[PDB]
């Protein structure tokens, strides 16, 4: 007489059930193994976790406690694998990494 969220069963925070609904809404005749939405729910949470991890650290370095788009671009554009995973992506109001080519530097 009790209910149990598959997400809880998977030990994950992301919508396992919702994922399955979504995998179906977007890929018709394909049947979907119960494993599918759990495996993915987990993978997205992981990548989400990974981004927030560094976004924060970036928010911190900015003397701030509130993550904003900037903190995400910084966290992404400075990290090799994420910046790779996100080529072709534009983060609204994320700016650009601070970078000036030495040829353009004053001289000193």
């Amino acid at each position: 007489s009790t209910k149990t969220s598959r997400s809880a069963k998977a030990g994950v925070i992301f919508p396992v059930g919702r994922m399955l609904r979504y995998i179906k809404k977007g890929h018709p005749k394909y049947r979907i193994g119960v494993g599918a939405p759990v495996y993915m729910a987990a993978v997205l949470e992981y990548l989400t976790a990974e981004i927030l991890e560094l976004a924060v650290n970036a928010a911190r370095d900015n003397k701030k406690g509130r993550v904003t788009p900037r903190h995400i671009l910084l966290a992404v554009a400075n990290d090799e694998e994420l910046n790779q995973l996100l080529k072709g992506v534009t983060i609204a109001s994320g700016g650009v990494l601070p970078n000036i080519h030495p040829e353009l530097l004053a001289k000193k």
């Binding site: 788009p69 534009t90 994320g94 700016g95 601070p98 970078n99 040829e103 353009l104």
Partner: protein, 98 residues
């Protein structure tokens, strides 16, 4: 008197805007550009507030990126002044070349 040497304010401008994230094109003017272009495809159109923001965000990010590649092409040529042909090469190599 006082006066900053050529290229100092620019380096300062670079360091500045490269630290910020606000848009750099004037909103109104942009919105007018959008609707102007949009017309030639479909008359009596209605843009959402967001669909214009998104449009501009994309555009500025696009140009900011294109300028980075263009800067590389100038530097490649022993220069530091970006000229039109740096933009051409950059876009040519990109695959855009329009």
């Amino acid at each position: 008197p006082h006066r900053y040497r050529p290229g100092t304010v620019a380096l300062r401008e670079i360091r500045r805007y490269q630290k910020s994230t606000e848009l750099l094109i004037r909103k109104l003017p942009f919105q007018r550009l959008v609707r102007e272009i949009a017309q030639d495809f479909k008359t009596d159109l209605r843009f959402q507030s967001s669909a214009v923001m998104a449009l501009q965000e994309a555009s500025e990010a696009y140009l900011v990126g294109l300028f980075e590649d263009t800067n590389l092409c100038a530097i490649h040529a022993k220069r530091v002044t970006i000229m039109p042909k740096d933009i051409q090469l950059a876009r040519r190599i990109r695959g855009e070349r329009a």
